[PDB]
Automatic annotation (TrEMBL), chain A:
Residues 7-300 form the Bacteriophage Mu GpT domain. Disulfide bonds join C127-C214. InterPro entries: Phage_Mu_GpT (IPR018774). This is Bacteriophage Mu GpT domain-containing protein.
Length: 300, 302
């Protein structure tokens, strides 16, 4: 029991923690974006401005200019683990040490359930426009002049109160991912191991909790889609055609190719006849075994 | 970036703010309280009671000790605490937390007044060195100098026939000891608990900023102060004043009680001003009690 032993133990724990948190199978990175923040809240400007280029010259020819803002209000999360009542000074530390690398792996994927919490409750979150995220009055600009006129359509699909499960169609080719991920501080490791410490005289359960600050938000509304009707080949083709047909101001094509698909496990049967068979479904009949292969997450 | 220099700067700034706020805290208890310093856990006051005087010296010296029993104030302590949440410290939101320490210091400085007035408002159900509350109807007064023999009924509490109103007090401060004595074992102290590896960094991140004090207040002698829930009228004030003035100690010796100040709740300030503080009455006649007492408004008595 010497300070050198404490230093070596802290170094070993730091190495073990740093080994994890890096190779975790992150899925939020596909739909989220890493942004370095510095304050407790970040405001937004434009919300539906597709960045594109025009023939005319100068570097000042056309642009949308920003609108009212949208804040993130970064939140906070934490984990904690430790049992060292008998591990220390007993040669039993060989265990309780490699098992927490899984804790690091799981904690590193937390943004996944955070983005899925936003995804599931997208209809109950206020949008900068004023109405629900999946409303039927999404503004569309006929011309670039102030606030000329905002026409709209029934953007998404929903039947007349027919039972079903909500499956979402997402895209990730554009780095303007539909969701946002703002982080103030990266996860940190704290060691309270202090010989004969006032509050750690209690056996030797040396607390090794961590601290982190981050949150997620909404980006583009058009990049994401939803469908609660019965999952069918005709309905799938309808959804794909509706999403691909989307056009921005001026009627200029977008080339938006959907890449990600999210389906609940209950609909997994249909999500498997749609993907994985080249004989009768997504095959002989309306072959569609190319894009938006189902990922079948379960954090919802 | 967080360094020990910033923590030291925060500590010194907080100390400066706390001391500045505490130094300029209004003092009100000093008017109707006596400060007696102590260096022990408790003190005994058995000298309350019979009023020392001069005698004819018929051939002996009359000395008095005090009963083996004591008042036994049994001083206690008080505290307060405030947090910072440790979340805006990194954001550099130093504009806030400046006047918070000022408010904390003002509250600490003003606490003794609240304690004194809370004790005073409990004078109906809190005993004095005698076996009767500070305001009662059957105070015992002896007919002998030594303090023995059949006693008589004495009352310093006046109440109406029905529908009693707010309570007001008439006290005296001319004498050496005021009716209430407020002890001070240790001056209010502050402790800046700002560390990166101390408790409440795990329970819930926030820095401990609290103060500790050891003080208590107790009654003096009931011969001066009095209470009356009746309406503050000219007749009521006159009767209370004349009853207080016409007081006789054990052995039938006058005390020469000269009431000094009148304490009323904030809701009776208008009545107190009408009774005392106006040269002419409502009808237009000179007051017979103008400038007789010094009205002292207070909010601690509701």
């Amino acid at each position: 029991i010497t300070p050198a032993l404490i230093s070596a133990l802290k170094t070993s724990f730091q190495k073990h923690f740093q080994d994890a948190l890096a190779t975790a199978p992150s899925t939020y990175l596909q739909v989220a974006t890493v942004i370095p923040s510095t304050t407790a809240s970040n405001t937004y400007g434009w919300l539906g401005q597709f960045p594109k280029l025009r023939e005319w010259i100068g570097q000042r020819v056309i642009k949308d200019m920003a609108a009212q803002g949208y804040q993130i209000t970064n939140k906070l999360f934490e984990s904690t683990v430790g049992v060292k009542r008998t591990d220390i000074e007993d040669d039993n530390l060989g265990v309780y040490g490699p098992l927490m690398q899984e804790m690091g792996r799981a904690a590193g994927a937390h943004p996944d359930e955070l983005v899925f919490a936003l995804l599931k409750a997208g209809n109950a979150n206020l949008c900068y426009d004023g109405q629900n995220f999946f409303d039927t009055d999404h503004p569309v600009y006929p011309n670039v002049d102030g606030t000329g006129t905002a026409t709209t359509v029934s953007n998404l699909f929903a039947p007349a109160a027919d039972p079903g499960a909500a499956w979402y169609l997402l895209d990730t080719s554009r780095s303007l991912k539909p969701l946002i991920y703002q982080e103030r501080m990266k996860p940190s490791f704290t060691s309270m191991t202090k010989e004969d410490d006032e509050q750690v005289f209690m056996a030797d359960e040396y607390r090794y909790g961590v601290r982190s600050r981050c949150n997620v938000g909404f980006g583009f509304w058009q990049l994401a889609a939803m469908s609660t009707e019965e999952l069918n080949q005709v309905n799938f083709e309808k959804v794909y055609d509706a999403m691909r047909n989307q056009k921005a101001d001026g009627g200029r094509p977008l080339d938006i190719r959907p890449n990600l698909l999210v389906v609940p496990t209950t609909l997994r049967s249909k999500a498997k006849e749609v993907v994985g068979v080249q004989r009768l479904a997504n095959g002989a009949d309306n072959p569609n075994f190319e894009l938006v292969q189902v990922l079948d997450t379960a954090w919802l």
